Amino acid sequence: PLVVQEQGSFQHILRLLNTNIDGRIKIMYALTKIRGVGRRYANLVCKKADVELTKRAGELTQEELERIVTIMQNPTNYKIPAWFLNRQKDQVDGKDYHVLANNLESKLRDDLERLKKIRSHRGIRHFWGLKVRGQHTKTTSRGR
Amino acid sequence: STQSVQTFGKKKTATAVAHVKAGKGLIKINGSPITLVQPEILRFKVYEPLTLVGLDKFQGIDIRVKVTGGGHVSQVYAIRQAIAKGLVAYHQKYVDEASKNELKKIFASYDKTLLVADSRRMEPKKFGGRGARARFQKSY
Amino acid sequence: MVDATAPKKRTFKQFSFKGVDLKDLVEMPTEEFTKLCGARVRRRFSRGLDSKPMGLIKKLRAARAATEPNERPAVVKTHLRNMIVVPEMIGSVVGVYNGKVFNTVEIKPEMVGHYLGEFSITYTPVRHG
Amino acid sequence: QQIHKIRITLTSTKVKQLENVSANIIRNAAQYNIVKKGPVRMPTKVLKITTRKTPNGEGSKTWDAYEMRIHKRVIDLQAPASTVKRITQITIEPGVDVEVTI
Amino acid sequence: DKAQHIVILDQEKYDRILKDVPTYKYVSVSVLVDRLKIGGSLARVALRQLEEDGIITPVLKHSKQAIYTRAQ
Amino acid sequence: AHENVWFSHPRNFGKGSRQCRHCSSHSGLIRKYGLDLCRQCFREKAADIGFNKYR
Amino acid sequence: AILSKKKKLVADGVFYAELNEFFTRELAEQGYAGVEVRKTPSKLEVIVKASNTQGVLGEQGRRIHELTSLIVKRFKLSPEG
Amino acid sequence: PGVSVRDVPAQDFINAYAQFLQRQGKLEVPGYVDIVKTSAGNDLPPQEAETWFYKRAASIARHIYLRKQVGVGALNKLYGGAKNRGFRPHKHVDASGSINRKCVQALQKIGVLEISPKGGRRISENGQRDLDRIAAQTLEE
RNA sequence: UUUCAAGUCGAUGGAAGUUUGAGGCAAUAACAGGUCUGUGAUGCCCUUAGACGUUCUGGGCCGCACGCGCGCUACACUGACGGAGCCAGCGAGUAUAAGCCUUGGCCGAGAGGUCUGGGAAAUCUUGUGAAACUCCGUCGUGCUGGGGAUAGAGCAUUGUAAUUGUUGCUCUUCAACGAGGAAUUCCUAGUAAGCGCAAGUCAUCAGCUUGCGUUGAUUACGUCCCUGCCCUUUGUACACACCG
Ligand SMILES: [Mg+2]
Ligand SMILES: [Mg+2]
Ligand SMILES: [Mg+2]
Ligand SMILES: [Mg+2]
Ligand SMILES: [Mg+2]
Ligand SMILES: [Mg+2]
Ligand SMILES: [Mg+2]
Ligand SMILES: [Mg+2]
Ligand SMILES: [Mg+2]
Ligand SMILES: [Mg+2]
Ligand SMILES: [Mg+2]
Ligand SMILES: [Mg+2]
Ligand SMILES: [Mg+2]
Ligand SMILES: [Mg+2]
Ligand SMILES: [Mg+2]
Ligand SMILES: [Mg+2]
Ligand SMILES: [Mg+2]
Ligand SMILES: [Mg+2]
Ligand SMILES: [Mg+2]
Ligand SMILES: [Mg+2]
Ligand SMILES: [Mg+2]
Ligand SMILES: [Mg+2]
Ligand SMILES: [Mg+2]
Ligand SMILES: [Mg+2]
Ligand SMILES: [Zn+2]
Structure with missing residues (x-):
């Protein structure tokens, strides 16, 4: 207070799940740099x-940093609701499940061929790089 | 009963009904003291009818108002009008009219809206635009 | 973060859908199967199956029984492209209308739980220039 | 089943006949020593319908704004049921409809 | 991108704060940021304590604006 | 056989579920106050119904 | 059945509008001017104004008798109503 | 003269009743308070994780004091706000039902409120008694 | 002031002194303006049993290298979130249906589900406790907690049927955009601008219209410089009238 x-004791640069985190960011918003971890x-x-969220990233000790990466990799074991997860x-x-930095694009990818392997309509438009959710295309998305 | 006069003040839609009774000087807004009105930055709008005449005028009378309708700001102007009109209306009925004309002089010389309700109302919207005068942007 | 390793393991893995492998998946009744798929599929079967989806399944079952040298089970044609693929109809071949033609699809295991018309595009893709 | 607290509800589109029937009933409830409550002016209802002027879709976007005002009045009477109904036939008007509820 | 304002308070800056803030006609969140090179959040906790320590007199209290002056 | 197919599709809760009193149209219907009249048919009958333009 | 006040006054108007056009199509040759619907207890008085009240009331009033029957059968009204 | 809830500013009265309700500790707090967001229109959970439930229960108690048979559906609308639809305009959306229903249910077993006849939730015989008490210990400074 | 006329500008009184504010109606003629896709309004032509009628099934009207117009979000700190304060008006609402508005209670993080009750309505939904807004905090000039496209996985609702995601909800991804060239639109007081709410379409879907109210200004109260229109004079070989 x-x-x-x-x-x-401050640590300017952190490395969590093979991702570099700026140590002068508040801890709650520093983890959002890790892909698969939102606010x-x-x-x-x-x-x-x-x-406590009032700490910067470098303020944390090693003991706390390992305690966080343990929870993110095992969310259900810490009373984290199933509906709160990334890949349920x-x-x-x-x-x-809750996929993380390097695992996210791999299983996101595996979903794409899984759509493309069965040659569904949604997978095809994903292949073409077009919008798949029914959005109009005659007048929007003209950049490159 | 006793010496009781009942009045009202109005803004755009807000209307505040003031009851002015004889008493120790009790002044409440919807059952709450005026010293705790939410719009703090506008607390002096309702303090104006008090300090203009002097708090000594409110020793013998107690005022309880009920304000409904309008918005947050529109309600503040409705309340201050009901108080100002209520103090004047009590003097005209239970005090000599010489004193009532004295109070009305200070009030009018400071702000017409203390006693006279503002007549401005919202203009109706007309088709061909999103507002009363505004129109949809035109293209050639 | 400590560390990380990814040594993926197997055991003659059979294709599996949400914890249920192909062997048990196919002979599960469709009433039990819908209990382990998405919200839209679960809602559809609770709303009541009209005669049209059930009639196609009966013909699809017979078409497989027509051939017992274990080759493709001959095509059943249909307009009902709001059909949800169930494990019962894996390996069958159906002709699904796209408005003009009978697109022919073979029911692969990874198609299960999808809409039958989602594999027959109704429009030829645009090609400028 | 004698003297009762009886409600007569008056609704119409035009006010002239509504006030004549309303006043005529009040007049007959005056010379007859029957205590009465009313008439009560219910807040008038403005039935508004806003259409496009164009039968087609060409021209400036111009709109009509039609209205249908409905005025409703209720009058409370303290009289036996035979007396109130015959009063209604005395003050019968094509425009105004009457419903009687105990 | 050029800001790089300090968010952790060391000892060299701490006593520099207590040596520099008293010699200010008017201190605020931006005044602390502008001249002490500290971050906005660190300024807010600094202002709330310096007032509790008596060095700083609160001219006006508000969430979006804190007007303070020297106590000497 | 044919009677079970002819006019078999449901024609409720739709735009084709209702029609104008006057013109039996499907487009531009007015359902307010249970009019069930086409917007074109309403204009040519508004005075008779009791709707007038005042403001 | 149970009809709201807003929906009841509109229905009377819509009934008038449809009834008025019916006379215009049927009694066009008799100079039909307008119709007045005088509601009353136990009866629904309808006053039609025409240049010629013989074509409507012809051959012992057969047409007007055969014309009121077309309204009882279309609006589900009692024959005496 | 006496003191009532209406004689004290609302914003700092709730901050005082919230402090009492946390230190008293008898109010039962559901297990998901560290996880859930107050409204579906909100995008983040409350920033005062340890104390947000107590303050909201304090707010609910004060709001019910000034009125008569307010339901739980009305409480969702009151604390609901404008949703941040991405490109569509903003709209008002009600708050979460469980959070409000648990508070009034939690407040019903601590003794401050009770189910009123003809719907809603009245303030208890003791509900008036103890709120007016907190008001007195608010304005002495 | 004025031809001392029509009037105009200031004060005072007044609720109102800009036609008191706003609209509805609206002349003599005219256009090859738009609609036969509103009509059991129509002349004529076409078709009329392998129908161009009508019905059923499925798709399309959404389809995407691109140009244009009406708009919605935003580019942040006069701000985002998180709590707390907590104020309108215009309106709508059902039955043996084919199902209306739905409080209150109970489940559910939500979306939503369930049980009762009220209301054919100044009675009940409803004080529609709306949002901007205000207070107190976190953030601290950073493509950041601005912005929330695109997309993956999952949960509900409506509907016979949601695949080309109807809509809603949960977690995750978090793009252009750092205030916009030549040009160009709307607007003078409760007006403009924000900000929401209701009614229409409507089984579901409102970034749309029609209204309503909340907060509420800057700057003229002048001119013909641009633009459009009207009048007078003029020319005319035009009058189907310059599309001559
Ligand atoms: Mg086909
Ligand atoms: Mg609110
Ligand atoms: Mg709020
Ligand atoms: Mg926003
Ligand atoms: Mg937004
Ligand atoms: Mg006028
Ligand atoms: Mg033409
Ligand atoms: Mg033409
Ligand atoms: Mg035609
Ligand atoms: Mg035709
Ligand atoms: Mg039509
Ligand atoms: Mg045919
Ligand atoms: Mg279209
Ligand atoms: Mg398409
Ligand atoms: Mg337009
Ligand atoms: Mg806020
Ligand atoms: Mg009400
Ligand atoms: Mg998103
Ligand atoms: Mg970002
Ligand atoms: Mg222009
Ligand atoms: Mg649709
Ligand atoms: Mg709507
Ligand atoms: Mg439209
Ligand atoms: Mg000439
Ligand atoms: Zn029609």
């Missing part, structure tokens, strides 16, 4: 890890 000082998700893992009711094993 007052200004405090520290020396040598809504980052708010809860810090609250489940008892990391998975295609192959049917369980609720």
Whole structure:
């Protein structure tokens, strides 16, 4: 509840899940740099890890940093609701998952060929690079 | 009963009904003291009818108003009118008219809307545009 | 972050859909199958199956029974392209109307749970120039 | 089933006949010593319909704004049921309709 | 991009704050940011404590604006 | 057989579910106050119904 | 059945508009001017104004008798109503 | 003369009743308060994670004090706000039903409110007693 | 002031002193203006049983290298979020249906579900406790907590039927955009601008119209410089009238 000082404990650059995080960002919004971690998700893992949101990224100790990456990789074990997850009711094993920085584009990709392998209409328009959700195309999306 | 006069003030849609009774000087807005009106930056709009005449005028009378309709700002102007009109109307009926004409002089010389309701109302919208005078942008 | 490794493992993996592998998937009744797919499919079967989807399934079943040297089960044609693919009809071949022609599709296992007309585009793609 | 608190509801589009029937009933409820409550002017309802002027879709976008005012009045009477109904036949008017509810 | 304002308070800057803020006609969130090179959030906690420590007198209190002056 | 196909598609809750009193049209219907009249048919009958232009 | 006040006054007007055009098409040759619907207890008085009240009331009033029957059968009215 | 809820500013009265309700500790807090957002129109959960439920329950109690048989559906509309539809214009959307219903249900077992006849939730015989008390311990400074 | 005329500008009184504010109606003629896709309004031509009638099924009217117009979000700090404060008006609403407005209670993070009750209505939904707005906090000039396209996975609603996602909800991805060239539109007081709400379409869908109210200004109250139109004079070999 007052200004405090520290020396040598701040860490300017963090590395979490093979992603570089700026250490002078507030912890809740620093994790949003990790792809697959939005503002809504980052708010809860810090609250489940008892990391008060009033701390910058470099303020955290190693003990706290490992406690966060553990929760993100195992969300359901920490009373994180299934509906709150990124990839729930998975295609192959049917369980609720939350894919992260490097895993996200791999399983996002696997969904694309899975649409394209069966040659569905939605997968085809994805192949063409067009809008797949029915949006009009006669007058919008003319950039490159 | 007792010496009671009832009046009202109005703005665009807001209407504030003021009851002025004889008493110790109780002045409430919808059952709450005027010292706690929400629009703080406008709290002096309702303080004006008080400090203009002097709080000594309110020793013998208590005022309870009920303001409904309009908006947040439109309600403030409705309240201050009901109070100003209520103080004048009580003097005309239970005090000599010389004093009533004195109070009305200070009020009118400061702000006409303290006693006279503003007649401005919203102009109806006309087709061919999104507003009363505004029109859809034209192309050739 | 500690570390990470990705050594993917197998065991003669059979294709699997939401935790149910192909062997058990195909002989599950369609009443049980809909309980493990999306919200739209679950709603559709609760709303009541009219005679049209059920009639196509009966013909599709017979078309497979027509051939027992284990080749393709001959084509059943249909207009009803709001049909939801079920594991029962895997391997059958259906002709799905796109408004003009009978597009022919073979029901692969990964097609299960999808709409039958989603694999027959109704418009020839635009080609400028 | 004698003297009752009886409601007569008056609705019409035009006010001249509505006030004549309303006043005529009040007049007959005066010389007859029957206590009465009314008439009560209900807030008039403005039925508004806004169409396009063009039967086609050509020209400036001009609109008609039609209206149908409905005026409703209720009058409370303290009299036996036989007396109130015959009053209605005395003050019968084509435009105004009457409904009686106990 | 050129801002790079300091968000962590070390000891060299801390006593520099207590040595420089008293010699200001008017201090605010922007005044602290403009001249002390500290961040806005760090300025807000600094203002709320310097007032509690008596060095700074609150001229006006508001969420969006904090008007303060020297207490000497 | 044919009677089960002829005019078999549902024609409720749709634009084709209703029509003008006057012209039996499907487009530009006015359903307010249970008029069920075409917007063109309404204009040529508005005075008779009791709708007048005042403002 | 149970009809709202807004929807009842409109229905009376719509009934008038449809009834008025019916006379214009049927009694066009008799100079039809207009119709007045005088509601009354136990009866629905209808006054039609025409240049010639013989074509409507012809051959022992057969046409007007056969014309009021076309309205009872279309608006589900009692024959005496 | 006495003191009532209407004689104290609303904003700092709730901050005082919220403090009492947290320190008293008898109010039952549902287990999802650290996860949920107040409204479907909101995009983030409340910033005061430890205290937001207490303050909202304090707000609910004060709002019910000034009125008669307010329902739980009306509470969702009151605390609801403008939704940030992306490119479409803004619109008012009601708040979450469970959060308001749990508060009034939680407040019903702490003794401040009760189900009123002809719908709604009245303030309790003791509900008037203890709110007017907090007002007195608000204005002494 | 004025031809002391019609009037105009200031004050005072007044609720109102711009025709008191706003509209509805609106002349003599005319256009090859638009509609036979509003009509069981129509002349003529075409078709009339392998129909161009009508009906059923499915698709399309949304289709995408592009140009143009009406708009909605925004590019942030006069701000975003998070809590808290908490104010309108115009209106609409059903039955043996083919189902209306729906409070209140109970489930659900939500969307939504369920049980009762009220209202054919100044009675109930409804004080439609709307949003901008205000207070207190977090953020701190950073493509950032601005912006929320695009897309993956999942949950509900309507409907016979949602695939070419009807709509709504949850998590995630988080693009151009850092105030916009030549040009060009609307507008003078409760007006402009924001800001929402209701009614129409409507089983579902409002970034649309028609209205309504909340907050509420800057700047003229002048001119013919541009533009359009009217009048007078003029020329005319035009009068089907310069599309001569
Ligand atoms: Mg076809
Ligand atoms: Mg609100
Ligand atoms: Mg709010
Ligand atoms: Mg926004
Ligand atoms: Mg937006
Ligand atoms: Mg006028
Ligand atoms: Mg023409
Ligand atoms: Mg032409
Ligand atoms: Mg035709
Ligand atoms: Mg035709
Ligand atoms: Mg039509
Ligand atoms: Mg044919
Ligand atoms: Mg189109
Ligand atoms: Mg298409
Ligand atoms: Mg336009
Ligand atoms: Mg806010
Ligand atoms: Mg009401
Ligand atoms: Mg999005
Ligand atoms: Mg961003
Ligand atoms: Mg122009
Ligand atoms: Mg649609
Ligand atoms: Mg609508
Ligand atoms: Mg439209
Ligand atoms: Mg000449
Ligand atoms: Zn019609």
